[PDB]
RNA sequence: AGCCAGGAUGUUGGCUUAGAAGCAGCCAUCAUUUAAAGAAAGCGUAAUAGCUCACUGGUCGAGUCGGCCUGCGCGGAAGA
């Protein structure tokens, strides 16, 4: 996975959730689109 | 890159960019981008905001850019001590309080317009907002 | 979807339908193809036009709305989907067998041709029609 | 009748018999020959003309041939030796490209309707005419 | 297109701000050979008003005291970068 | 919101004849059958095929996607 500071929506697919605090973007067509923090 | 061509003065004073903006309404186009924050734009940026602007919306619709510099910042050079002078002006900056307008569009969508504003608002150092025409 | 007053304009013009109407076929595209569409829907055509509504909306409380104010027997026929195909030209017309004909000729299934309303009957194939 | 097995849509010109470069490997992809669309092939395409694409149904089977019955030329290639322009399209909207009336493509509707669908001649005649409007030609009606 | 508002009793920069710092804003009402009416009025309404284009040239009714005066925005003074009004200019 | 449904015959459409075939680029952006269908928002193809979504049907059936205005927070956030 990626770590930016601005984590967004790439694909229509991607969901974002917040574990443990940090803000992540879960994608299932794409493992790519999967991506860490902000 | 924007530049007076020819001034009275080479070098002015540094001045302080204080109280509220003046050209806040949108004159000419349909849509605006605002500046909300206080700063101060370089001709580099304004021309990189424009080339944001300008190749999103492609060859259709029209810009204004209602902000010049005319105001030239000098810069000192490395390695030297303070004193023997005012240094050299190195670039042109113009002085950008909240409530100015910087740049104008029309004839293209609303949906359209505000990505294109997006692209130049992340160019430059202040926070600015989408502003519509509204008539009187 | 729009207002409460264009949903009432559809039903309140399907209201109407009954009103100069009388006999009615159902039918359930449960795997239908569009190349079917053009031959039930078509047929209406070949008895002269766009009029033959067979507005497609039979939901408990839709089209049943409708019901209280025209043919109360049509209520019992919503569980399931239906298709009210209203008909004008010709008392009784042939297009109640066509549904059940069209079935067989590649349209999996339709509804089983439960059929609607002339002596308040249910599932009947028939072929007694004045022709 | 038969749900989808392998039948697909697809050849240039009927003219051009055994076309290579043009379709190939697609109608012999399956287990049916290259020769297949040759000799059975413009059986059915003299009767009517050449130099004309016409499609067919290619519902292969595990027997060798396949069963077909041909349909009908679709609705710009005709207009072209109909219309007059051989270009179609381009810039419509910004630079009308030609133009056709109501009476001619009303008259050239219905010789299709073997395999048009419809309830009225007039019904599919603003189809028929419309595929006009898109192709930089505004119905002159 | 009608809207009721107060009379206003305190007039300038401290009253103003503190008014502004409370969902309404100031207006004013003069035409004809009367005198002028500094109008109070509340923010959250007029602001969804003027999004309608008959705002600004159809004719209002603003409630005062009972009595119902009919007039014309005239002028208007946004607040420079934040969508919101300061102002209105309420000719007769 | 889910859930078995439908979601076209010519469109190999002219185009630079090597193809653009609802979907590289051109623009048009048909109108019929009609519960509905844009000659198409995406995926997939040398291009097709094909699978989705727009929409429309029927089931369970109640509150619900979105934007500003803001009150406090969250990440961005590594040194001996
Ligand atoms: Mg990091
Ligand atoms: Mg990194
Ligand atoms: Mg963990
Ligand atoms: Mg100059
Ligand atoms: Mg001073
Ligand atoms: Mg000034
Ligand atoms: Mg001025
Ligand atoms: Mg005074
Ligand atoms: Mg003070
Ligand atoms: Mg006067
Ligand atoms: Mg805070
Ligand atoms: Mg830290
Ligand atoms: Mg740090
Ligand atoms: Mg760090
Ligand atoms: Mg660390």
């Known amino acids: ?38 | 890159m924007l530049q007076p061509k020819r001034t009275k003065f080479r070098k002015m004073h540094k001045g302080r960019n204080r109280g509220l903006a003046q050209g806040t309404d949108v004159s000419f186009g349909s849509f605006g981008l605002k500046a909300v924050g206080r700063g101060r734009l370089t001709a580099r940026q304004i021309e990189a905001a424009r080339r944001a602007m300008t190749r999103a919306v492609k060859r259709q619709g029209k810009i204004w850019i209602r902000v010049f510099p005319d105001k030239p910042i000098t810069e000192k050079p490395l390695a030297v001590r303070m004193g023997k002078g005012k240094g050299n002006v190195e670039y042109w900056v113009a002085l950008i309080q909240p409530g100015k307008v910087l740049y104008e569009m029309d004839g293209v969508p609303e949906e359209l317009a505000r990505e294109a504003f997006k692209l130049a608002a992340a160019k430059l150092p202040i926070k600015t907002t989408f502003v519509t025409k509204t008539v009187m | 979807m729009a207002l409460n007053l264009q949903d009432k304009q559809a039903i309140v013009a399907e209201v109407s339908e009954v009103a100069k109407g009388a006999l009615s076929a159902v039918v359930a595209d449960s795997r239908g193809v569009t190349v079917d569409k053009m031959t039930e829907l078509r047929k209406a055509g070949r008895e002269a036009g766009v009029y033959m509504r067979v507005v497609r909306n039979t939901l408990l409380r839709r089209a049943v709305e409708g019901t209280p104010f025209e043919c109360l027997k049509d209520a019992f026929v919503g569980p399931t989907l239906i298709a009210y195909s209203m008909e004008h030209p010709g008392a009784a017309a042939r297009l109640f067998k066509e549904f059940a004909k069209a079935n067989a000729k590649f349209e999996v299934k339709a509804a089983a041709f439960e059929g609607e309303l002339i002596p308040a009957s249910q599932i009947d194939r028939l072929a007694t029609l004045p022709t | 009748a038969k749900k989808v097995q392998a039948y697909v849509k697809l050849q240039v010109a009927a003219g051009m018999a055994n076309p290579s470069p043009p379709v190939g490997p697609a109608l012999g992809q399956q287990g049916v020959n290259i020769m297949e669309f040759c000799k059975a092939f413009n059986a059915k395409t003299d009767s009517i003309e050449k130099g004309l694409p016409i499609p067919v149904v290619i519902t292969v089977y595990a027997d060798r041939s396949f069963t077909f019955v041909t349909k009908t030329p679709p609705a710009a290639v005709l207009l072209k030796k109909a219309a007059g322009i051989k270009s179609g399209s381009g810039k419509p909207n910004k630079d009308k490209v030609g133009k056709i009336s109501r009476a001619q493509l009303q008259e050239i509707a219905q010789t299709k309707a073997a395999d048009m669908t419809g309830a009225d001649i007039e019904a599919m005649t603003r189809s028929i005419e419309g595929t006009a409007r898109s192709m930089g030609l505004v119905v002159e009606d | 297109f009608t809207i009721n508002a107060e009379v206003r009793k305190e007039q300038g920069k401290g009253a103003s701000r503190r008014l502004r710092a409370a969902n309404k804003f100031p207006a004013i009402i003069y035409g004809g050979k009367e005198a002028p009416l500094a109008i109070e009025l509340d923010h959250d309404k007029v602001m969804n008003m003027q999004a309608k284009a008959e705002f600004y040239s159809e004719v209002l009714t603003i409630v005062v005291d009972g009595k119902e005066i009919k007039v014309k925005a005239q002028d208007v003074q946004r607040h420079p970068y934040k969508p919101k009004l300061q102002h209105i200019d309420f000719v007769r």
Do not use: F
């Open chain 1, 1 to 38: 996975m990626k770590v930016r500071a601005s984590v967004k929506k790439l694909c229509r697919n991607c969901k974002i959730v917040k574990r443990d605090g940090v803000i992540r973007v879960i994608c299932s067509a794409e493992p790519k689109h999967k991506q860490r923090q902000g």
